[PDB]
């Protein structure tokens, strides 16, 4: 099983790479995304914490940040620490299991129709669920689209 966009990337049964794994973060709080972009911390939901923590121990993990109401691209970051119940950001609530440190790769606030299309179909054809893992080809495409949109915006 080989990635459709990268012949050198082997995929598991789910279409997920063994080495690079991608999760979507759907944010509806300007204060939370602004805080995360300044302090490089994110809060992980209890519902997706086990799969995200297991991925952190096995591979490189990236969060792709998308606005809930618009699907605006907000950036993407590598997760660089495991879940910690004592380092939760101030905006977290009872639905969060713990915080993770992140390392921002790109940060923006823009719209891409191509990005919105991918997020709109990420749940096997339906709208993405917050915290879900995506396929390798979706994460690779989204990161490239963010890089390309940032690139074109500076011009």
Author numbering: 331 to 485
Give passages from the manuscript.
Mmi1 is an essential RNA-binding protein in the fission yeast Schizosaccharomyces pombe that eliminates meiotic transcripts during normal vegetative growth. A C-terminal YTH RNA-binding domain in Mmi1 recognizes UNAAAC motifs (where N is any ribonucleotide) that are present in multiple copies within DSRs. Surprisingly, Mmi1 binds DSR RNA using a divergent mechanism on a surface that is distinct from the m6A-binding pocket, including extended protein sequences located upstream and downstream of the YTH domain. We propose that the low-complexity region influences RNA binding indirectly by reducing dynamic motions of the RNA-binding groove and stabilizing a conformation of the YTH domain that binds to RNA with high affinity.
We also determined a structure of apo-Mmi1 residues 327–488. The core YTH domain of our structure of Mmi1-RNA is similar to apo-Mmi1 and to previously reported structures with a central five-stranded β-sheet surrounded by four α-helices. Interestingly, the low-complexity N-clamp region adopted a similar conformation in two structures of Mmi1 determined in the absence of RNA (this work and Ref. 21). Both apo- and RNA-bound structures have crystal-packing contacts in their N-terminal regions. Furthermore, structural alignments of all known Mmi1 YTH domain structures show that the core fold is highly similar (r.m.s.d. <0.5 Å), but the N- and C-clamps are more divergent. This observation is also consistent with higher relative B-factors in these regions.
